[PDB]
């Protein structure tokens, strides 16, 4: 089968924090307090604001769409300035980053989140 696209959203803001033993990578459709569309990736870290990404990676969204929250298997970069999140089985979510966003900086956070 071809991989099934679950969602294809434009992203204006990407943020990364490590807070309360959790790495947090967020993709927001706008810069408001309650963006219209978002995905958040999270994974435990061994230290409160740093340390080692640990455990199962987790994915979250406000959009009404079915997917395993623990289903992330990886990512792919696509043109133009696209992050494709691979969700098992054989699904993906396309996050088209507006041009301002340094996609290599987003990728480095993703390499962190998926490390071991």
């Amino acid at each position: 089968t071809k991989s099934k696209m679950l969602s294809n959203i434009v992203i204006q803001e990407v943020k990364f924090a490590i807070e309360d033993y959790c790495a947090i990578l967020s993709f927001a459709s706008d810069s408001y307090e309650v963006p219209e569309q978002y995905f958040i990736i999270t994974r435990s870290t061994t230290e409160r604001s740093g340390g080692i990404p640990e455990g199962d990676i987790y994915l979250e969204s406000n959009l009404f769409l079915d997917f395993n929250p623990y289903g992330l298997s990886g990512y792919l970069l696509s043109e133009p300035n696209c992050v494709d999140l691979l969700i098992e089985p054989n699904n993906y979510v396309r996050l088209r980053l507006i041009e301002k966003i340094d996609i290599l900086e987003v990728e480095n956070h993703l390499k962190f989140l998926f490390d071991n």
Partner: protein, 108 residues
């Protein structure tokens, strides 16, 4: 999908129930909304809400009986809550026909 449910009991070091309430995810409050994105969405999970329900005193036990294995930011909320309070925080959830358990304890 139906909201996630949790039952939250806070008992103090002597055994007195200080709090027993039932909780649901979803429907962000304005207090929550003021946290900014993404923290405000992250705060509408049952476990995160529980840790923000009631302040804990040293020696308290906050029991949070939820429905799903604890999410990463949920775990960190319950850990930070226990460490910042010098109290015990316990989370349970059904799995394989049982209630599974995780605990965190701050040591003062």
């Amino acid at each position: 999908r139906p909201p996630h449910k949790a039952t939250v009991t806070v008992t103090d070091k002597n055994g007195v129930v200080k709090h027993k309430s039932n909780l649901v995810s979803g429907n962000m409050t304005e207090a929550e909304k003021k946290l900014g994105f993404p923290n405000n969405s992250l705060a509408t999970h049952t476990e995160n809400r529980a840790t923000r329900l009631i302040d804990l005193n040293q020696g308290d036990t906050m029991l949070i009986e939820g429905q799903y294995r604890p999410c990463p930011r949920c775990k960190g909320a319950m850990r930070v809550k226990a460490e910042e309070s010098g109290a015990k925080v316990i989370y349970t959830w059904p799995e394989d026909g049982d209630l599974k358990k995780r605990e965190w304890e701050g040591t003062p």
